[PDB]
């Protein structure tokens, strides 16, 4: 639930 354009995710 982090946008597709965001460079970083988190898991």
């Amino acid at each position, epitope marked *: 639930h982090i946008g597709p354009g965001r460079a970083f995710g*988190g898991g």
Partner: antibody
Amino acid sequence: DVQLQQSGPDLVKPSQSLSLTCTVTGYSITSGYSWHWIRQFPGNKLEWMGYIHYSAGTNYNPSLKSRISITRDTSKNQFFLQLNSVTTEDTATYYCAREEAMPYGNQAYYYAMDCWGQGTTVTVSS
Amino acid sequence: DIVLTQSPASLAVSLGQRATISCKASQGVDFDGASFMNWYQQKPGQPPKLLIFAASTLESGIPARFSGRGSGTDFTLNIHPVEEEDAATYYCQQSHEDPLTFGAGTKLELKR
């Protein structure tokens, strides 16, 4: 509680470097998903500046890419922003912010910018 | 980039009325069943404060008087009923992609 505090100069001569500091009290920068920097020019126009992931990595707004740099300090628990070759168009109010997991839906998170500092007014002039 | 065109810039609503701020986007902003739009309200001399996020999920501490909706390229925020401690500037904002961007905002002035 949990609070961020922008600290830094009020007046920077053009062609120098802007080095602002955001002191995070009551939360380890490590516990953060990501810490951002945003500035707001006269007229209230807002501009996202860049951020630093909990993995120490970064991402910057292209329009500034060439001259911006965001770093952090685990021990003092504050992250910094440095901006090179400052011109008069760099006069605005700067704010550091936090992005965190927000409970969206059922047992699901969603990251957003929820806590912001007071903002510090930076004047670029001779 | 993704541009956020908010409407309108100026909005005047007398007490106990209904405030309706739109906010269109250049590209759609949904993904994996979530819509990456958010809203902040800024009062003069204050940092922007997060109201709703993900289009409709209202942030705790915020009166259920505020409402968020829309999907794709169109979104919206409504106040029912408009209070005095509601005069501010509202900004929609997308977390769909980096670089993140903001709208121009909407000065909400209360009629008297």
